[PDB]
């Protein structure tokens, strides 16, 4: 209701870099808020696409940002009569970026990997990898839990079980408050999908350069399955964390599986051991129910609610005609040991091909009335199709059906305005939480300040 749309700040990256594909607020040990931006098609130092990360400091005027530096050199290690190989060309560094304390974790989901042993090989495949940075010290670490040294043949002999060769780890990422990094790997287990968890501290302390295959003892990966419902489900396309079992001493994981059960889609709430606690099923096939997942208490009762996005949902219209507009589903958490029932509210897009629900950002309390608010992206919405982000204020009954405010893309056609979003952080120190919106198509980020 109170994001100023006239007073904007534009941060810009280089052409064709997809600067703004992903972003997050980052806070240094001093307390100063900055904006980390991911640019998955940034040219490396030898004019080949490697992707890149930028750390933007808060300015009213905005402008260009400094490049958070990472090692873009490929690595080879001949060890144990094998040849380990990393390939960073077209790895998409900054396809996702997340911050926690004084660390930043930017991932390259399509970083390739191979192992050669005489005439045989593991196969050159996109295991993915995450680069971890600590700006104020300069420390760097990596985490690539899907790398292996198993030759192609052995997977065939074992019916492709425990096949992590195509994980694309870091496709999605989130960090718990304790400092456990959780990665989405929708290619995991032959495109079932998987999650890999590891304490940020333990990643840093077990990493050394040039090793390539190393053990992070405290890590916890999810499991493979031979249940056809999970096949090609992309479980981990999106990921999130929250509190859904009443016990504050444990953390629950929210996983999006948008093509689960023959493209029906699903989202699951799980414990830290990856035992399923609940499963929400998609309403309509190919709608990509699970593309987005957001956790926030919107009705002021202290229990986290779940928001799921299905951006390709087709709405029914006059004379049996369908219209792709996109849909967001709200699930308010009830009291005690009781499952998440049917949706408390359905929000549906209005523009054809608008992809409403492509991103869902908890805004915190935008108007400081007590109830938390959210932002929902329609990257190709608005009458022109340039994009649109819609604010929804929270209330006792959940959310409002009608949006409180509508942000129209200031960038030209194709920008994907709203493809990325983040809030709940006060960047200018005025008491109200703000919103950063990414337009990778236009290589920019728009910062909207909340005002009284």
């Amino acid at each position, epitope marked *: 209701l109170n994001l100023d749309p006239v007073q904007l700040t534009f941060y810009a990256g280089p052409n064709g870099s997809q600067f703004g594909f992903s972003l997050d607020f980052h806070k240094d040990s001093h307390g100063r808020v900055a904006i980390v931006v991911g640019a998955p098609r940034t040219l490396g130092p030898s004019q080949e696409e490697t992707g890149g990360v930028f750390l933007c400091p808060w300015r009213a005027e905005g402008g260009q940002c400094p490049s958070l530096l990472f090692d873009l050199r490929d690595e080879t*290690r001949n060890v*144990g009569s094998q040849t380990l190989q990393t390939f960073k060309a077209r790895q998409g560094l900054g396809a996702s970026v997340v911050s926690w304390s004084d660390v930043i974790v930017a991932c390259a989901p399509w970083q390739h990997w191979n192992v050669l042993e005489k005439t045989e090989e593991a196969e050159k495949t996109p295991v993915g990898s995450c680069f971890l940075a600590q700006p104020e010290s300069g420390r760097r670490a990596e985490y690539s839990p899907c790398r292996g040294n198993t030759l192609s043949r052995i997977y065939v002999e074992n019916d492709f079980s425990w096949d992590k060769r195509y994980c694309e780890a870091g496709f999605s990422s989130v960090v718990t408050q304790a400092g456990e990094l959780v990665l989405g790997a929708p290619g995991g287990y032959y495109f079932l999908g998987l999650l890999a968890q590891a304490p940020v501290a333990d990643i840093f302390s077990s990493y050394r350069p040039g*090793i390539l295959l190393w*053990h992070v003892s405290s890590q916890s990966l999810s499991f493979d399955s031979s249940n056809p419902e999970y096949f090609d489900g992309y479980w981990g396309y999106s990921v999130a964390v929250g509190e859904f079992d009443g016990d504050l001493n444990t953390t629950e994981y929210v996983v999006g599986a948008p093509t689960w059960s023959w493209t029906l889609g699903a989202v699951e709430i799980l414990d830290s051991y990856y035992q399923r606690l609940h499963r929400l099923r998609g309403e309509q096939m190919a709608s990509y129910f699970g593309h987005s997942v957001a956790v926030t208490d919107v009705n002021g009762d202290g229990r986290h609610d779940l928001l799921v996005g299905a951006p390709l949902y087709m709405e029914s219209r006059a004379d049996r005609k369908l219209a792709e507009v996109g849909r967001v589903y709200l699930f308010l958490q009830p009291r005690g040991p009781h499952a998440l029932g049917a949706p408390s509210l359905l929000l549906t897009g209005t523009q054809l091909y608008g992809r409403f629900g492509s991103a869902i950002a908890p805004l915190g309390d935008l108007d400081r009335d007590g109830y938390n608010d959210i932002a929902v992206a329609a990257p190709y919405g608005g009458p022109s199709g340039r994009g649109q982000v819609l604010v929804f204020l929270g209330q006792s009954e959940g959310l409002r059906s009608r949006p409180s405010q509508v942000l129209d893309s200031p960038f030209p056609t194709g920008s994907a305005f709203g493809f990325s979003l983040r809030g709940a952080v006060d960047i200018d120190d005025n008491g109200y939480p703000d919103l950063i919106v990414g337009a990778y198509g236009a290589n920019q980020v728009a910062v909207y300040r909340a005002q009284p």
Partner: antibody, heavy 119, light 108 residues
């Protein structure tokens, strides 16, 4: 605290077999490769082989192929070295070894198990 | 099989000395080398992995160096606890091979 606890000293007869054990403590035996190494005063340290207890696959130095059989059991969290056709050359101290971080390294070691072949 | 020739086999040294143990491979092993310590009667403790990286808990005074086929362990300012045997192991190729060993001895 990562620790490899090996079974006690063995007094075995030539021609017989013996099976040494190495039990994980403060970690799971499937976490990494587990190796077995031979030490003798004159000849020194010799690498016997390894196992990946997650899947059972093993490797051996051709010198110990046939004599040595490494196995592991994740239920009991233990790796084993079995030596058949015991000769006087098998009198040695035997260690199980695992890496700290690097997959291929040899960092953590058991206290060793003494085997004396004698009639 | 790669041969690991370690040198010297023994040295007589004093507390406070800085000493070095070399270890030469029969072919290049691109830092895929470990350093081990065995104290009298005791078992083994890992000192260095992958050429230069100290194992967790190992004191600052130990360091590794070298490249290709020639590497060195250096102990700076010998503590009385450092009078022991030391070995190198390579893991560039299977089978893993060890060095002969170097025994640090108390000079008098």
């Amino acid at each position: 605290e990562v620790q490899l606890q090996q079974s006690g000293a063995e007094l075995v007869k030539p021609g017989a077999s013996v099976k040494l054990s190495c039990t994980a403590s403060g970690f799971n035996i499937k976490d990494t490769y587990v190796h077995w190494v031979k030490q003798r005063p004159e000849q020194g340290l010799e690498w016997i082989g390894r196992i990946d207890p997650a899947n059972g696959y093993t490797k051996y130095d051709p010198k110990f192929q046939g004599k040595a059989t490494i196995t592991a059991d994740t239920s009991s969290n233990t790796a084993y070295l079995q030596l058949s056709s015991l000769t006087s050359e098998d009198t040695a101290v035997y260690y199980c070894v695992r890496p700290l971080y690097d997959y291929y390294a040899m960092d953590y070691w058991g206290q060793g198990t003494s085997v004396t072949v004698s009639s | 099989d790669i041969l690991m020739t370690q040198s010297p086999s023994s040295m007589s040294v004093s507390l406070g000395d800085t000493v070095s143990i070399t270890c030469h491979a029969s072919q290049g092993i691109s830092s895929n080398i470990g350093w081990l310590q065995q104290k009298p009667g005791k078992s083994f403790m890992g000192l260095i992995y992958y050429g230069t990286n100290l194992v967790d808990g190992v004191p600052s005074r130990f360091s590794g160096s070298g490249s290709g086929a020639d590497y060195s362990l250096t102990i700076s300012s010998l503590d009385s606890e450092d009078f022991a045997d030391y070995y190198c192991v390579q893991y560039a190729q299977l089978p893993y091979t060890f060095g002969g060993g170097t025994k640090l001895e108390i000079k008098r």
